[model samples]
Target: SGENLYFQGHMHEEENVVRSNIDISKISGEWYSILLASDVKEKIEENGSMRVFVEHIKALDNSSLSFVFHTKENGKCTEIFLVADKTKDGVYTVVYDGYNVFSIVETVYDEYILLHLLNFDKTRPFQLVEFYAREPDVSQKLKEKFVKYCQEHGIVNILDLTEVDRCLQARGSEVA
Candidate 1:
């Protein structure tokens, strides 16, 4: 299984961090957003402290994936769709709106995954860090691991996703 295919790489400030490659097939399902913290200007102005977002992913093949993200912008529910191209193990490049390239960095994948969807261009400089799970809530152990990884990577202003109540309602209304 691809689940055992681990990779060691120099990710941002971390040195030689060992992380498992995301097996897209196994991870394709409805994942709830647990936490999202970023300094991205658009995100800062669009969504405030509370955000309720969900990702519905479908694997087209070993290297291709389709996803629908239901989120909010300016307090209005918005839907965004994109196709992801796998560039390497655990790394996917998704072009949004045809021009902007977003990198999907999956550091770990199992019951929950540590995800970083970042703008590929350094000049634009936007990073959205999210912790997603098969269930509505992640376990305490998984939460700790993801938080530690985020701290090491300089992701500040980490918010406890539980503080946001709307996501719970969204998750409850969805069917698995």
Candidate 2:
């Protein structure tokens, strides 16, 4: 079934880390986390729907982006704010409340985005694949595209995050 593809036991570190170009405006929209691959055990136990709303800050330079991270857990919602400061073309430093260094590793904009979120201080490192669109559900073609990229990158222990219906239902009545 390829269900809980855990990391520590599987990945080849020598393999090249993936990279891609991300158009700032193209990624300004809502995105849902569809898959997660991590080298940390704590991340494996985290099961919930993660929604991200990306807004381009045109007031600032073209490189700035505002993000709202909506995470659901234990029948509650937690919101985290982040600002991605663009360093170079297709590269950004995602600043959150903690010391995590998150960067948008790869993406095709409206299709999907791969993020490399590293927090060495807390010993947390994870690779995430998120499908984005105005709607919640993305196309099947995009899902396969993400899966292929994951397999190619030696991310063996992948966590499927499609059980979002529960979160969606709860979101309707719950306040942010």
Candidate 3:
């Protein structure tokens, strides 16, 4: 078991983060109803809930797998951490970057392609035109399928990976 320290229930991860460790009571009080699907609810444990979100922030222009980063720009990668709602709707939320960084989406098919992008408006239909890609149809189809699946699943927020580096990278290239 982990060491249990009894202190004030609030702690700050950064100057911007108000409440990083979300207690059950506090979380329940703030969010109210806790209706979640089987998969989503399973993510939460005695300690808390967690999941990785991926969003298609923009269209790729040069056949890049994702708008966020390509295998050449970075490397061949599968599965990225994103900030989406527990429900995996269009209302993506990037947790690694806090409440005001980017968006994330859950529930993607294994065969379907994924492209993570930024979401300025985390609660509306994503702009389909703001893409950076060679095959617009492919990315568009992926996005469409994702949205449709979300609609059927009753998800609320998607995850955005475009802001991952900006949120997780250390300051000034100096790793602390």
Candidate 4:
């Protein structure tokens, strides 16, 4: 019975976030997509917007966060970029495939970042959690942290992005 507690479908913690004390500017740099989970399994699956691999994050002087992403499939990599303007209480609003509210659920400067994002494009909004690190070579120790964190907060689907190395490698040379 206790095992089922994690199966609670993400609704319990959706829209809830921690108060961010760290400066968002310190988080601007390259990041590796270690893991991602979402309430809607389809959203983190193949071709889903949540499936995009993170390349970089930059905080603008205008209180905005610029994000660079890469989607890799069949030896093809596509670059995707977007900006999310800060609102208040460490929350940000961005318009992309959908309107989303972004929160830095947790972060450790140059170590790792755990993000909670609520995408409200549909009548029923969905939750997406992202686990990213400053370096591409993430240790199992840090990965366990991501796992335990998500386990405490329910999200139904999960994917480990080993193939992202290929995409990140394609970064400097291509406009594609």
**TM-scores for the candidates:** 0.68, 0.61, 0.21, 0.78
RMSD per model, one decimal: 8.5, 11.5, 18.5, 9.8
lDDT of 4 by residue, 91-129 (tens): 889886689998887777777788888899767578888
Which lDDT value does model 1 have at 148? 81
- Model 1 score (lDDT): 0.62
lDDT of 2 by residue, 120-154 (tens): 44544454444333445567775676677667866
Clashes (N, CA, C under 3 Å) per candidate: 0, 3, 28, 0
Error of 3 at 79 (Å): 12
Worst 10 residues of 4 by lDDT: 11-20
Q: How close is candidate 1 to the true structure, as a TM-score?
A: 0.68
Off by over 4 Å in 4: 1-19, 73-75, 163-166, 174-176
lDDT of 3 by residue, 1-176 (tens): 99998886548422322122222221111010111122233332222122222223331222111322111113222334232332232323343322422222322221222223332435432321111222222344545555554456455344322333321221123445
Off by over 4 Å in 1: 1-18, 39-52, 97-110, 121-123, 165-176
**Candidate 2 stretches greater than 4 Å from native:** 1-21, 47-60, 96-98, 103-106, 122-126, 169-176
Question: Which candidate's TM-score is highest?
Answer: 4
Judged by lDDT, which candidate is best? Answer: 4
Evaluate model 2: give its lDDT.
0.53
Q: Candidate 2's error at 118, in angstroms?
A: 3.2
For candidate 3, the TM-score is 0.21
